[PDB]
Amino acid sequence: QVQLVQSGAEVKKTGSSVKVSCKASGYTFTDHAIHWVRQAPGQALEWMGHFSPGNTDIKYNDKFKGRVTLTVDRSMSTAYMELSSLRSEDTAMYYCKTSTFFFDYWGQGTMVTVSSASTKGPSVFPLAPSGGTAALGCLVKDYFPEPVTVSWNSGALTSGVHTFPAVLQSSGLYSLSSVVTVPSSSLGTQTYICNVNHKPSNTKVDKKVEP
């Protein structure tokens, strides 16, 4: 089974550097070039360069040449992408992948967030219930970095749940709401608890939302 496993998400301040790794397995490392492709939030794919491990052919997009360095550790079947003098434009998902179009395998992506924000778990506030349908929810405010996960009633409630994509606020912290619609006749009998997990800060909040 061919696998490309990338290193975890990173937060860096502007001007810093980041080095992302890409561990290849399930094939002979020197059989394919490793390409690096990134994608800023909501934007198009962008090709950064490639490293061909068998013969050390390294090619860069001039947009990144001199700020990015591609290397490999052939002994560990690992490719690296180092990006220096980080800027706001560099907040993005970074992917490694094999070959051009002859061996379609991609790593799972590494999110690099360029920010001066400190890691912070969210404040969780109720969106209380005010046609037999009632809407309720949780406002998941002021956390950093991405991502958060939200479940309802420990995963027992999934129908009608909408957990919105996060927005970045002017504070540099993210915010989102998770909402669910339920029968009004259940409001007095069924407890509704949003389970908010923010793994970067190891925070877990279970907030009961009451009418």
């Binding site: 198009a44 794919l45 404040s123 209380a128 929810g137 406002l139 909408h162 989102l176 709401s177």
Partner: protein, 219 residues
Amino acid sequence: DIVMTQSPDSLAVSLGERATINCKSSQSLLNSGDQKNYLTWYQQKPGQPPKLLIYWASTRESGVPDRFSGSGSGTDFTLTISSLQAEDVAVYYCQNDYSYPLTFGQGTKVEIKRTVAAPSVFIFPPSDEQLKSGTASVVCLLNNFYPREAKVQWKVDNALQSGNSQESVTEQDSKDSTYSLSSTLTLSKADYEKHKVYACEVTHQGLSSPVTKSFNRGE
């Protein structure tokens, strides 16, 4: 550098109907040595890496069904998806594989077109817990509507707000092809406690009249 320009930027196609996505390159991608066009198509769903669909302009990747078809030559290429399915909702990219730097088109986002569906609107005042913090968030929810275009206006004591709200929209629901949207108005506690009537007014193609949901602070 080869510039790759896709058209349209977004496409809404009914289930079972044909989607057509065009990709134009600023230079020919036809390789004299093998007479192949080095044009590649990828499918990318949110949160996932792209997936190879077609290469050499018209050769389908193994595992890709034959309702995906690539055509064209030189500078003008087309991806046709026949009998569109919900699992085809994605952003599609063409890529220049002819000469460095390898460059991508800007993407074409495909969604399912369905009959117009009006949003169900809900408003939520800020929680007492949040108010202790000096900032107040007021949330307006537009639930399960199509198409995605919608106008959400905040009114405070009937004054139209500007600059102090942010919107978030879901991806398309795979089973019913709808969107939901949140608009969040952020005020200082001082401003929140100064004013009384909080309203969000929603305009949408499915509504013959705009829908307003409102509350009076403290009720």
